[PDB]
Assembly symmetry: D2
Homo-oligomer: 334 residues x 4
């Protein structure tokens, strides 16, 4: 039978995960939650997806608009095997006891503390670590991107320094600045480094910044090599690493805008680029240091990771069988 | 099957090319490119033959080992009509070539009315293009203004609209302004006369450019000659094709959420072919009607392009073509 | 000299504080701050006694070793009037506090009209505030509308203006939208009625927010009731105080260049106190006048607050105060 | 008094002209323009003689009623030195004209290293320009890197910095990207070798362009050769000229507030000639120092051009010039 899934928090990550779940033949979307009957709630219903009020506390918002719901999250928790928690950072921790009391497994997003789960997850890097687990944290958008390429060359990395040039807000978020400024994270290192280390063992330090863009994040990566490695070896490795794609600035891929245009060209749902983008020409080796630039489509790179986490937690399949299945259902040729 | 070709596989061209492949009374023969960039490779991957725009550009493709199906001259030999989606002003420069070839041609809104025998917006003056050889589909903004204004023209004594336009399309990263409002000092703006090439209406417009890439926005004022109520306008717009009412009260706070609606639909390139009208903005004060609409400039003109082909070849009547095109693109009403 | 205090050392607050400092008939007793940030340190550095906005804010200061000259309650005891520059809606909550202290108070444009006895724009209705206790200087945009509209009021039968607004001030990095246009679905916009609290005219306005920080832009259309020519309007604007004409032909393509003119003048905080009007935008078509103007929202209500003070304490005639304020701020004409 | 002419009254050009009129050992002979736009008028209003950058441009001022004092050649004959502030690449082109006229010449950062005899940053290699006829003050980004790195040069055996640049200056409204991050796929980028043109140090850089106009920001990592504490670095910066420390805790959340500091100063054009360093960003982890700084690209190289003039004309000793220049601009 199919694993019964519920999604708490039908937000930017949540609705995309819900969609992914509907594309799996071994999983069934029991329902999702919303805190208000806005256009997204109407869309879920329009899609035939049962809409549950996130809590009894939000029920009046629905009743007010005369928007019928299938119940509250408490009702949904009684009919699922696992809940994908896609609520605001920090809110996952608050929901955990509700999940434990209901006896259902739970997946939390990167916005939560490592604290929250038994293990942090990135399919291609530590799938087996989540086997049978009940609580798994799919790391954040930037952490996932960093892990995908760093993990592929971990054996050659002695130390890595990465600068996160982050977008200020997702395309659908119009209530957040900065309109015109660069906001640095003065804490050195940013949360990214240690977060990476909750998935793969590696010496890493990171620094982050926020700039006025909504498209994708960009990573400036520097690795001190403790073992021989050439430029071609690196493109070869990246060329063969799943959920990673090389883009040539020479073909016209000048910025994150053209990278996203590639996804729009594929006619992807929400222009989702599940794959981490690496500028081919940026991969260089000077002395014993490797350098390269990558981009992350933060609205969707963790989508495939949530699906695979589900397979590992229920021991539905081995690592590569799940990744390939997840990949095919989302159009990731990898 | 009407054989179609697209000269200029850019923002409009690639979306019109796609629309053609969804019409079973048509056949996409090929598209042109001036260089083998990632968009040329995409066309090829889609199985669409790509021709070098001109004999001049051939070496660019040869250099990269990118095999082409030929050049625009070769293409012109294989089509009944060419859809020209080259930069504004370049379409006129191509007209002679199309003339000699003996093929019908459709130009986009960036060309002067000069370039064609008539300007077009299906739901407004479809019949005016029946059998023509050269037709120009009006700009993204003119199309948006026409669609809603045409629906209430019988009540319109005078119209004044302000165009708050995006500064550059999302895939255009070489255009400012990054932080400023650029006014068009030519007043009245050229949008009004452009609307008058499609429908008879007293109109005046003014335009501005702001740092956004998503959608243009229009502020419309209409002096009424006949009484009309808020509900009347809502009912008319709800029964007007290729127009959609969005409620700020349901979360549509800005053009970003409007586009989010198209992304939720999983629309190709997040295309919102339809003009978006904020339901709450529709107000009547005295003898004046006010409303706000938004236009997704990357795609509102593509269904107009497909209907123009049907009219020019007299393949179908106005509403039959419109209905068929809408279905092919997922436009409900 | 009139004893002046300013509650709210923010965007408007610190600029009005500086303006007060330039008057030979006024004295700045102090400014209020809710926390010891770099702006509080600046005020202290300038020698401006800094008062904690409230009792419940003194801890933040003590925690940082920042000595304050007391609280708002203390400051009110030492002034004849306080310029309230707190966020919209807070002014109303502060009025009772001011009345109790028995001091006169000036409110900004973010407050409702009823918060004061009269609304105000020096060059329009200076006299209306003579000897008053509570006056509301209308918003940055309302002020821009009044200056230009007041000068042609006698020919205006009806006016429709569209406000294309900056999303956030340069110093405000916590507010969106990054990429979108957000319309105000309420028709009319709050601007029309606020203008009517200063000058009697028929007007309806609509507003939008776009991603820029520099200045707001107004699209103005005026239905005429008396003969008027373009030339007449230019001349009228060339002769109305606090309004300057800019030529696109000289390089003023957008609001960035308008602001660049203020930077070139070395204006404090790049303040452009005067309303900017694109000369080339002025045009009359039939019975309607059109023009485009820009407002530097950070400083255009500054000179108005000063004049408000003189009218309220009846310190001088309308034009003596205006000329006196203008000279102190470098205001051109 | 040395006679200075500025060729290219642009963003850097008009600000340097101002700086010179603020000096007591020099006089602005005139500036040049290609068209009589509003900036050309402003220069005239300031009483600055305006020369048409070239004869072929005279008609432009003739079509208008704009009287000019002549061409670039007429200016070259009345100066001891000319500050070239033309677009990058044009400086090299204009060099043969400066030579045939026998006048010293300073080029800006956009030009290639070979356009001058030595690249310059006053507080780092002032002496290197003493007496020379051709010197290029390095770019905004390199000046910022040099000022801070130079101060800890003796403790760094390796530096890696990432350049997060503003896409267009406040007054440049015809340049993107409006919404995107544009990378420099050439890595390391030209910034490192540019720095190496002023001070001797092992550095590698990478750059990016983002949708902002206010300031560039540098993410800096330094491999230490000698022990160094956070308090050590902070003290060094507090004692390094043309460098200022800012506290996020005091409200400096981003480049916008940093700029706001300059506006509060009522600084001309809101010029922040000094490099900004976020005090809280200074941290040492292992044998590595990390810190973040921001550069106001419109004004950062201004004081540098004034000092280069003194070095080239040997008018003063390193620190005497810098103190004087700093004084004239209100640096502190
Ligand atoms: N690009 C991204 O925004 C991104 C990328 C990677 C990971 N994530 C992670 O996903 C999680 C959420 O991100 P998001 O961007 O989807 O947030 P979001 O703001 O888009 O939506 C989160 C959802 O939480 C819902 N919500 C609020 N309170 C709730 C409650 N009490 N119960 C249930 N739902 C509630 C809201 O309705 C909203 O739909 C975070 O941990 C975040 O770090 C986000
Ligand atoms: N939002 C929009 O971009 C929009 C909306 C409605 C109408 N239009 C109109 O559509 C037309 C094109 O707009 P666009 O957005 O596609 O421009 P675009 O620049 O995005 O794409 C145009 C294409 O024309 C091709 N081209 C350039 N020179 C060519 C040549 N000599 N021969 C053949 N092809 C050549 C280019 O290679 C490019 O692929 C214009 O008239 C424009 O006003 C544009
Ligand atoms: N563009 C503009 O910012 C602009 C233009 C014209 C008019 N105004 C008007 O100015 C008035 C204030 O605007 P602003 O731009 O100065 O806002 P601001 O946020 O820049 O400054 C407000 C000041 O009030 C302070 N504050 C918060 N609570 C306070 C309290 N209880 N007491 C005292 N201060 C408190 C803030 O710390 C700050 O010092 C508003 O009514 C607004 O409509 C603003
Ligand atoms: N932030 C900056 O703008 C910045 C920062 C650091 C270094 N620089 C360097 O300074 C130089 C110019 O920078 P800018 O920003 O001032 O450019 P700018 O565009 O603002 O203008 C440069 C000027 O050159 C004049 N010019 C053009 N052609 C000319 C000609 N043929 N003869 C004379 N003058 C001509 C232009 O009109 C203009 O006034 C470049 O090398 C640039 O890299 C600029």
């Amino acid at each position: 039978m199919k694993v019964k899934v519920g999604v708490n928090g039908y937000g930017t990550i949540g609705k995309r995960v819900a969609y992914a779940v509907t594309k799996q033949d071994d999983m069934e979307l029991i329902g999702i939650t919303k805190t208000k009957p806005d256009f997204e709630a109407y869309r879920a219903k329009e899609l035939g997806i049962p809409v549950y009020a996130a809590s009894e506390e939000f029920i009046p918002r629905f009743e007010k608009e005369g928007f019928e719901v299938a119940g509250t999250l408490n009702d949904l928790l009684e009919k699922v095997d696992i809940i994908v928690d896609a609520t605001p950072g920090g809110i996952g921790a608050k929901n955990k006891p509700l999940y434990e009391k209901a006896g259902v497994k739970a997946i939390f997003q990167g916005g939560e503390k490592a604290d929250v789960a038994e293990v942090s997850f990135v399919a291609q890097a530590n799938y087996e670590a989540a086997l049978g687990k009940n609580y798994v944290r799919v790391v954040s958008c930037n952490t996932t991107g960093l892990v995908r390429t760093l993990s592929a060359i971990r054996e050659y990395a002695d130390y890595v320094y990465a600068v996160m040039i982050r977008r200020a807000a997702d395309p659908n978020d119009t209530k957040r600045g900065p309109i015109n400024a660069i906001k640095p994270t003065v804490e050195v290192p940013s949360h990214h480094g240690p977060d990476v280390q909750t998935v793969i063992p590696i010496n890493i330090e990171t620094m982050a910044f926020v700039v006025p863009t909504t498209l994708m994040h960009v990573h400036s990566v520097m690795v001190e090599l403790k073992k021989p490695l050439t430029k071609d070896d690196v493109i070869d490795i990246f060329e063969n690493t799943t959920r990673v794609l090389l883009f040539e600035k020479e073909k016209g891929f000048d910025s994150t805008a053209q990278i996203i245009e590639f996804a729009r060209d594929l006619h992807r749902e929400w222009n989702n680029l599940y794959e981490i983008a690496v500028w081919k020409e940026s991969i260089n080796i000077k002395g014993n240091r490797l350098f390269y630039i990558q981009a992350v489509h933060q609205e969707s790179d963790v989508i495939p990771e949530n699906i695979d986490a589900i397979r590992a937690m229920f021991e539905l399949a081995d690592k590569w069988d799940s990744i390939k299945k997840t990949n095919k259902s989302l159009g990731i040729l990898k």
